[PDB]
Design an enzyme around this catalytic site. Structure first.
Site, short mmCIF file in Angstrom:
data_model
loop_
_atom_site.label_atom_id
_atom_site.label_comp_id
_atom_site.label_asym_id
_atom_site.label_seq_id
_atom_site.Cartn_x
_atom_site.Cartn_y
_atom_site.Cartn_z
N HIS A 142 38.73 -35.37 10.60
CA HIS A 142 39.39 -34.51 9.62
C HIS A 142 40.79 -35.08 9.32
O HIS A 142 41.16 -35.28 8.17
CB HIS A 142 39.51 -33.09 10.18
N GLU A 143 41.57 -35.35 10.37
CA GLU A 143 42.92 -35.88 10.21
C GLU A 143 42.95 -37.26 9.55
O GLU A 143 43.72 -37.48 8.61
CB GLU A 143 43.65 -35.94 11.55
N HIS A 146 42.55 -37.40 5.94
CA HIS A 146 43.71 -37.07 5.12
C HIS A 146 44.34 -38.38 4.68
O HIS A 146 44.82 -38.49 3.55
CB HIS A 146 44.74 -36.26 5.89
N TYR A 157 49.41 -31.28 -1.30
CA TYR A 157 49.11 -30.24 -0.34
C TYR A 157 49.50 -28.82 -0.70
O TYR A 157 50.22 -28.17 0.05
CB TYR A 157 49.68 -30.60 1.02
N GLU A 166 42.00 -30.25 1.92
CA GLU A 166 41.51 -29.72 3.19
C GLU A 166 39.99 -29.70 3.33
O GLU A 166 39.46 -30.01 4.40
CB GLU A 166 42.03 -28.30 3.42
N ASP A 226 50.47 -20.36 3.73
CA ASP A 226 49.68 -21.57 3.98
C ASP A 226 49.65 -22.49 2.75
O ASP A 226 48.61 -23.04 2.40
CB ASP A 226 48.27 -21.12 4.39
N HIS A 231 44.17 -23.97 3.72
CA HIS A 231 43.13 -23.91 4.75
C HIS A 231 42.25 -22.68 4.56
O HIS A 231 41.28 -22.49 5.28
CB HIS A 231 43.72 -23.82 6.16
N1 LIG Z 1 44.92 -27.04 10.98
C1 LIG Z 1 45.08 -25.70 10.42
C2 LIG Z 1 44.51 -24.66 11.39
C3 LIG Z 1 45.24 -24.65 12.71
C4 LIG Z 1 45.05 -23.35 13.43
C5 LIG Z 1 46.16 -23.19 14.44
N2 LIG Z 1 46.46 -24.55 14.95
C6 LIG Z 1 46.53 -25.35 10.10
O1 LIG Z 1 47.43 -26.13 10.46
O2 LIG Z 1 46.76 -24.28 9.49
ZN LIG Z 2 43.76 -30.82 7.22
#
Ligand SMILES: N[C@@H](CCCC[NH3+])C(=O)O
Ligand SMILES: [Zn+2]
Ligand SMILES: CC(C)[C@H](N)C(=O)O
Ligand SMILES: [Ca+2]
Ligand SMILES: [Ca+2]
Ligand SMILES: [Ca+2]
Ligand SMILES: [Ca+2]
Length: 316
Positions: A142-143, A146, A157, A166, A226, A231
């Site tokens: 996943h990372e 990116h 983003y 995402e 967010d 996400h």
């Molecule tokens: N990777 C997502 C979900 C993480 C959930 C808590 N680490 C974010 O940064 O929002």
């Molecule tokens: Zn991500």
């Protein structure tokens, strides 16, 4: 580091033993020279300064609990590199074999992982919400994905373009998991999420609603939290991708699945050929349809399933 390529052995976060490519020069370093310009894994030593120190080990045996996150970060970055090379003919995230770097033991009780524009970073988790994040192959892919997106489409983003950014990472993170064939599923981060609870995950592609994420355009989050729900609204796109691959009837709309393989080919093409920094959901639909058209013809079942899938999640 300039040294002799060799192979070490260790144990990952979940206690599984695996071989890892290392480099020897006085110490054994977590430097894999067999893939592109290399895969380098660093120790951030519980601090936030990056990248930290290239992981040095005295006997090329990585069985200490402290070593675990490094073993997985290093190994899963390798699998993800292989996925992209063997399946999509892409050399590393920039397409020109750029070195892949990762730091583990980032900060203290950090429950996240991320690509900071130059490298991957993995927290160890607080032992309650997460255990070392590099332990999840879908999290690593996943990372790293990116990085691929940032070098190609460049989706910003925030808002819809960020939700797409995402979803693509969840989609390819999942495809890599299937590729490595290690207990694959359509959930995200289940191997490292809440060790005290079985069967849950951070997000679900097959049923995003299972955790309160939208599975239909009408339920998209429009707030500012967010970064405009990057996400959150990704669930709408994840559901579409799941339907395209597996099929099913969602909100009364039936979709004939075409498989993971074609799903990956269609989305990789859309990502590298048609998506732009500010593409929205509607444009993703168009990019996906055009990609499937390029690959299988405008009257194919593939183009038909992409259309049904996006109609199913209400994305017109
Ligand atoms: N990777 C997502 C979900 C993480 C959930 C808590 N680490 C974010 O940064 O929002
Ligand atoms: Zn991500
Ligand atoms: C935890 C991981 C999948 C990512 N940093 C979020 O989402
Ligand atoms: Ca050792
Ligand atoms: Ca799994
Ligand atoms: Ca998974
Ligand atoms: Ca759990």
């Amino acid at each position: 580091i300039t040294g002799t390529s060799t192979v070490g052995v260790g144990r990952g976060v979940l206690g599984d033993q695996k071989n890892i490519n290392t480099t020897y020069s006085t110490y054994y370093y977590l430097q894999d020279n067999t893939r592109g310009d290399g895969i380098f894994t660093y120790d951030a030593k519980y601090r936030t300064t990056l990248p930290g120190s290239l992981w040095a080990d005295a006997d090329n045996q990585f069985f200490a609990s402290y070593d675990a996150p490094a073993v997985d970060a290093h190994y899963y970055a390798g699998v993800t590199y292989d996925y992209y090379k063997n399946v999509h003919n892409r050399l590393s995230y920039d397409g020109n074999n750029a070195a892949i770097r990762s730091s583990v033991h980032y900060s203290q009780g950090y429950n996240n992982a991320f690509w900071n524009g130059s490298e991957m970073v993995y927290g160890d988790g607080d032992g309650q919400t997460f255990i070392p994040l590099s332990g999840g192959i879908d999290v690593v892919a996943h990372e790293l994905t990116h990085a691929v997106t940032d070098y190609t489409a460049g989706l910003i983003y925030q808002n819809e373009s960020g939700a797409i950014n995402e979803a693509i990472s969840d989609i390819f993170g999942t495809l890599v998991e299937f590729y490595a064939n290690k207990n694959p599923d359509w959930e995200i981060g289940e191997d490292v999420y809440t060790p005290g609870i079985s069967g849950d995950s951070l997000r679900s592609m097959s049923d995003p609603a299972k955790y309160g994420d939208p599975d239909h355009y009408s339920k998209r989050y429009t707030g500012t939290q967010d970064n405009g729900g990057v996400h959150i609204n990704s669930g709408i796109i994840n559901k579409a991708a799941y339907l395209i691959s597996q099929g099913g009837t969602h909100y009364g709309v039936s979709v004939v699945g075409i498989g993971r393989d074609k799903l990956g080919k269609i989305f990789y093409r859309a990502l590298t050929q048609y998506l732009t920094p500010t593409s929205n959901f509607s444009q993703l639909r168009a990019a996906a349809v055009q990609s499937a058209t390029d690959l299988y013809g405008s009257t194919s079942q593939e183009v038909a399933s992409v259309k049904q899938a996006f109609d199913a999640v209400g994305v017109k």
